[PDB]
Amino acid sequence: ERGKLFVGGLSWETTQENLSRYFCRFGDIIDCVVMKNNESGRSRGFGFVTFADPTNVNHVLQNGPHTLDGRTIDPKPCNPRTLQ
Numbered sequence: 001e002r003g004k005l006f007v008g009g010l011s012w013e014t015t016q017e018n019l020s021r022y023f024c025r026f027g028d029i030i031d032c033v034v035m036k037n038n039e040s041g042r043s044r045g046f047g048f049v050t051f052a053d054p055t056n057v058n059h060v061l062q063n064g065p066h067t068l069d070g071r072t073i074d075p076k077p078c079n080p081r082t083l084q
């Protein structure tokens with residue numbers, strides 16, 4: 001997979017729906033999650049966005065800085081977790 005972005009530095013208030021809304025300005029999104037604490041269900045302050053078109057990752061990176069919910073957030077390209 002080529003189109004996955006890690007996004008760090010999120011406020012714990014930011015929902016994955018809001019995260020997706022923000023990053024859709026750079027392309028169609030096929031997955032967007034905010035990682036949650038297993039016990040509490042609260043955001044851990046980071047997530048992942050997967051673009052349908054992997055060329056959109058570089059478009060995000062060259063059009064910063066990025067702010068969401070009053071935080072400067074930290075999008076980075078990532079090599080995705082591999083499955084079976």
